[PDB]
Design a protein around this nucleic acid. Structure first.
Ligand code: ZN
Length: 66
DNA sequence: CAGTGATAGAGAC
DNA sequence: GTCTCTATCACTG
């Protein structure tokens, strides 16, 4: 809305992924995509980035409760 | 309105 | 038949 285009300089320094449902941050201030943030923070150890992909699978949606 | 942390499901071999 | 990774939800300021 405020921006005329979604484009931007934001790039995942861990997997170069320029597309993601949400941008995460690290106590270093370096930008990270949602996957690296979730995987890197949970794993804490390097893992073949060859897993990353330029396509994101859309999952279903369901309220946690109620 | 946006972002985070936590939990669970699905896919491929 | 089993394992792993990733996304989405709800809540708060
Ligand atoms: Zn990334």
């Amino acid at each position: 809305m405020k921006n005329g285009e979604q484009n931007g300089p934001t790039t995942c320094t861990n997997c170069f992924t320029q597309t993601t449902p949400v941008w995460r941050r690290n106590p270093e201030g370096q930008p990270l995509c949602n996957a690296c943030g979730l995987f890197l923070k949970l794993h804490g150890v390097v893992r073949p980035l060859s897993l990353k992909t330029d396509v994101i699978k859309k999952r279903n949606r369901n309220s946690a409760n109620s």
